[PDB]
């Protein structure tokens with residue numbers, strides 16, 4: 001057993017707060033905000049050795065990242081940004097920093113009760129997205 005065991009599984013979005021404002025702060029345009037905001041993604045987290053994979057599937061877009069903690073990688077976001085990402089574990093929380101165009105956003109994923117809580121921060125704006133087991 002290991003690092004991210006409590007994250008592994010298949011998860012479905014059950015609540016979202018302030019996501020439109022988070023996307024505005026990120027720079028996402030009107031039509032993508034509207035369509036992306038409707039999506040109820042399933043997130044599938046798995047671990048194989050040192051490699052963590054996070055897949056997201058939705059009506060809007062499917063995304064997939066595989067990574068080693070602390071090791072920067074290239075990512076294509078659901079809103080089609082091309083970012084440089086680094087994900088670490090800090091006190092049991094996955095901390096994901098995305099850098100692009102001189103900008104930065106941080107996404108934290110943590111286990112809380114039977115939920116997986118995702119907090120997305122861009123400058124002063126946070127969005128909270130809560131997932132339950134599928």
Ligand SMILES: Cc1cccc(OC[C@@H]2CCCC[C@@H]2C(=O)O)c1
Nearest residue numbers: 036039041056058060061078107129
């Ligand atoms: C695949 C897809 C479709 C539409 C929205 C979306 O948001 C992802 C959220 C923001 C970016 C960080 C992760 C968040 C999460 O809910 O895991 C993803």
